Design a protein around this ligand. Structure first.
Ligand SMILES: NC(=O)c1ccc[n+]([C@@H]2O[C@H](COP(=O)([O-])OP(=O)([O-])OC[C@H]3O[C@@H](n4cnc5c(N)[nH+]cnc54)[C@H](O)[C@@H]3O)[C@@H](O)[C@H]2O)c1
Ligand SMILES: NC(=O)c1ccc[n+]([C@@H]2O[C@H](COP(=O)([O-])OP(=O)([O-])OC[C@H]3O[C@@H](n4cnc5c(N)[nH+]cnc54)[C@H](O)[C@@H]3O)[C@@H](O)[C@H]2O)c1
Ligand SMILES: OCc1c(F)c(F)c(F)c(F)c1F
Ligand SMILES: OCc1c(F)c(F)c(F)c(F)c1F
Ligand SMILES: [Zn+2]
Ligand SMILES: [Zn+2]
Ligand SMILES: [Zn+2]
Ligand SMILES: [Zn+2]
Lengths: 374, 374
């Protein structure tokens, strides 16, 4: 039995920025009240994890990163009512406390208990459950999935279908749900519309999936890497364009292609310039542009507010606008009912021990999602 | 007797920026096909007219400005079907051609025939109906209401109730409809919500009217001129704040006052800094901010897109989002049925010949709207 005891297990520790993960033994404390300890089964490599490595995202180090995952509950602390030992679960990098003003709002999902805005890198109680080489190690987004075992707050975990294939549904923990929701929930793409999607990685492909599910007539994929185009078309893009192929700025190209601007545009990269381009390419009177990409820390963009005064709407969202704990189990159930596909996002499957090689596949442009298996 | 003939009349010509208007004789050509010549009855002094004088808004000079007005049709050109001589009308500074993709869109109102985005200062056919001292004079927004007679394109005029009081309803041609629609149609203010309104001039007061009509529980007016507060409270503000009273930035003050950010905010001034402040003060996950104010020409704002990524919506609109020709007659009918009030916006009345004194009143901070009578 491990319940009530410290577990020594393997994890991928990031000691400093811009260095490889160190795969080594950590100690994982048992869960306190209202906490859940999870044996990880699969975790995805998301670009946002790479942002921690690259310094695009700032969070306290050293850290156990990872936020897109699925596993099995090993034990629960006093007072947990929503999961039990043996349950399949997905950690929620955006919590759902159910009590704050955001959780109570019909359209809000960025729960005030999140550790994204002003990261502390701890459990809700301000402490860590991880030690390595005698040193405390930070959590990441209340998830920390790059470990054989993690401990999360109850508000940061959802129970999912016992029959779920964890090596696929982990993607409901970030990339699929983010893109899909950004289209269907945040933008509210309409039937017959024209959409433009900037960035054709895992999140952008999931945006395309959502635009197609919503009935868009045209879905224009935009990427500087033309190797991304074939898979974009497979999941619903009607055309793809590479800005590098044109003498004009791509917002002008897209405005021309759409006979005056697109209905819906999405920035799914994380660059200030493409955020402004994406806004500009939507129709000036009624267009909507949604920011999904995470830009570099503390940098501001510049834009002309006449882009908004004419009638554009500009918004962003975390996790596709989904209330996390309510939504994740329903998304898994929908997947099990064949309502959407996940395989198109998965290009590589590697053992956890190959985490660094997985990050190299992402950085080279060669992968969409690598799933790591414990 | 004047049909088909040039009319000589008085107009207020702006020859140069940062100079008084010149009240002097102009020649007004008869209407060509699908044009309407209007004998003006009343016109308001809007801050956007002052922006032409100050160079905040760039439009070709020399010009006959004026865009908020009401009058009586003197004659119609060939093919006009929607008004007749003797009809009361309001010129539409945002046209409604009824045929472009925006006019056809259920939400859109910024008709592609507008002369706002890239002003030419002409009629739709690229020519002018005005001569002064033998020189052609530009139009403004297709309306040019600072003249005893103007000529407008048919898509830029709406017929209104024959019993309408023109010295009141002219305000439906800009300030009232802009602010009221910005609240009720663009933001879609909800019952029980908390709103913040930056700028308590004619447009901002009309935003407050709309927020109150929509059932907001709290409406916080924000102005650096505390003399504006009494009227703001009369039309529905629950509290007023002057940024100059506070050591902290007003976005922080408003976030504190609203226990974590407002539901809806409105920028109704025309400053880049207050556009960003108004965005920031809305709740980060579900807040909505609407830009109403007109920015200084060709200047960009700077902002951190994390404000949007958390969930905020940012939008702007012209003329409160109203499809102009459809909406203006209905707004007049509603005014006649006492569904809203216009008198709170009218602080001064002057003859047209005292237009410069009317601009002095606006610039000093003393007036909300001065209505000029011809
Ligand atoms: N808002 C959220 O909740 C959330 C969730 C998931 C991902 N993200 C962010 O979304 C972004 C995309 O993530 P991902 O899909 O996993 O990453 P990814 O797989 O790296 O995809 C990004 C794509 O952008 C392409 N690209 C790079 N520069 C340009 C350019 N100038 N023009 C056009 N295309 C370009 C690039 O070739 C690649 O295919 C990242 O910034 C993530 O951090 C945000
Ligand atoms: N979008 C549209 O269709 C549209 C229509 C009508 C008006 N406008 C614009 O809306 C703006 C307001 O017009 P208005 O109400 O006629 O003008 P106004 O009467 O000049 O009102 C502006 C108010 O802003 C106040 N103010 C100035 N600076 C600050 C500051 N730093 N903080 C807070 N308050 C400040 C000022 O004291 C005044 O009461 C102008 O830029 C107009 O051009 C836009
Ligand atoms: O990929 C999801 C994701 C985000 F959208 C962020 F904004 C962020 F800061 C982060 F750490 C993260 F993992
Ligand atoms: O006051 C309405 C109004 C505007 F909202 C503008 F954006 C503009 F350019 C203009 F000339 C105008 F009169
Ligand atoms: Zn919450
Ligand atoms: Zn992610
Ligand atoms: Zn039109
Ligand atoms: Zn105006």
């Amino acid at each position: 039995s491990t319940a009530g005891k410290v577990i020594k297990c393997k994890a991928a520790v990031l000691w400093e920025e811009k260095k490889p993960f160190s795969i080594e033994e950590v100690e994982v404390a048992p869960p306190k009240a209202h906490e859940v300890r999870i044996k990880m089964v699969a975790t995805g490599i998301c670009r946002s994890d790479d942002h921690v490595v690259s310094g695009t995202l700032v969070t306290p180090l050293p850290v156990i990163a990872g936020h897109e995952a699925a596993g099995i509950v090993e034990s629960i602390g006093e007072g947990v009512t929503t999961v039990r030992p043996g349950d399949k679960v997905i950690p929620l990098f955006t919590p759902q406390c159910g009590k704050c003003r955001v959780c109570k709002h019909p359209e809000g999902n960025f729960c005030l208990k999140n550790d994204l805005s002003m990261p502390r890198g701890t459990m809700q109680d301000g402490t860590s459950r991880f030690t390595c080489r005698g040193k405390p190690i930070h959590h990441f987004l209340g998830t920390s999935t790059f470990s054989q075992y993690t401990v999360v707050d109850e508000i940061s975990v959802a129970k999912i279908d016992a029959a779920s294939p964890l090596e696929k549904v982990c993607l409901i923990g970030c990339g699929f749900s983010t893109g899909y929701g950004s289209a269907v929930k945040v933008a509210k793409v309409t039937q017959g519309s024209t959409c433009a999607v900037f960035g054709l990685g895992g999140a952008g492909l999931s945006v395309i999936m959502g635009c197609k599910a919503a009935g868009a007539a045209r879905i224009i994929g935009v990427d500087i890497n033309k190797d991304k185009f074939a898979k974009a078309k497979e999941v619903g893009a009607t055309e793809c364009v590479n800005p590098q192929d044109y003498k004009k700025p791509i917002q002008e190209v897209l405005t021309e292609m759409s006979n005056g601007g697109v209905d819906f545009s999405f920035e799914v990269i994380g660059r200030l310039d493409t955020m402004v381009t994406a806004l500009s390419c939507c129709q000036e009177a009624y267009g909507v542009s949604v920011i999904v990409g995470v830009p570099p820390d503390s940098q501001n963009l510049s834009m002309n507010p006449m882009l908004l005064l004419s009638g554009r709407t500009w918004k962003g969202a975390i996790f596709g606008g989904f209330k996390s704990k309510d939504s994740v189990p329903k998304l898994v159930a929908d997947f099990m009912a064949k309502k959407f596909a996940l395989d198109p996002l998965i290009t590589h499957v590697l053992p956890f021990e190959k985490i660094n090689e997985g990050f190299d596949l992402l950085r080279s442009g060669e992968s969409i999602r690598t799933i790591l298996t414990f």
